[PDB]
Design a protein around this ligand. Structure first.
Ligand SMILES: CC(C)(C)NC(=O)[C@@H]1C[C@@H]2CCCC[C@@H]2CN1C[C@@H](O)[C@H](Cc1ccccc1)NC(=O)[C@H](CC(N)=O)NC(=O)c1ccc2ccccc2n1
Lengths: 99, 99
């Protein structure tokens, strides 16, 4: 589809079979999720943006479906106010910026 | 242009007569530039990101040229590792997300 930027580009994703709302974020290298209790091994990581760094848990090879387009890769879980879909998964769904 | 996302969507902009590299960021509501001088009055403001809140200088009605496209709007100046072009300006240049 085509997603306009008049409002935050929030879309429904499925991860762990849960449905969530998440921000399509061309400025994010990573995919960062609101705290959720995913099973599996993880590695600690620190990621940064405006305001500083937060501690997150890195889970690998997690399926994430984005408006019906399937992806699989790394998701970082921790105390973010918003679920963010970053470039690692936006590339997998063939997302471009256009103007 | 059509811009893919296997690398950061960094483009050249012109602001205040100077060229800068900036990130095309669909996740950012606002446009936030690294600390610099701009002409005119500014007002103190605060904005929040993944790592928490920062103090910024708000400049209104600033012209910014983004890959040759003209925008004129609010630019926030503050401590950042990256010059970020947010939706307030992306929408002025007709930028959408597509997949
Ligand atoms: C820019 C404003 C403040 C207007 N908005 C944001 O920061 C929004 C805020 C919402 C709500 C909180 C969670 C984050 C989301 C989306 N961000 C926008 C992002 O696109 C944001 C933009 C940004 C890029 C680079 C530096 C600072 C801000 N990106 C990130 O926060 C992500 C997190 C991540 N690791 O995926 N960051 C980066 O991609 C990144 C790249 C390079 C780099 C270099 C040095 C230091 C930090 C850093 N972060």
């Amino acid at each position: 589809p085509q997603i306009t930027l008049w409002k935050r580009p929030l879309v429904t994703i499925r991860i762990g079979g849960q449905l969530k709302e998440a921000l399509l974020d061309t400025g994010a290298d990573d995919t960062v999720l609101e705290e959720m209790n995913l099973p599996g091994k993880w590695k600690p990581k620190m990621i940064g943006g405006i305001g500083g760094f937060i501690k997150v848990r890195q889970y690998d090879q997690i399926p994430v479906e984005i408006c019906g387009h399937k992806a699989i890769g790394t998701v970082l879980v921790g105390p973010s106010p918003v679920n963010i879909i970053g470039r690692n998964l936006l590339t997998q769904i063939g997302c471009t910026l256009n103007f």
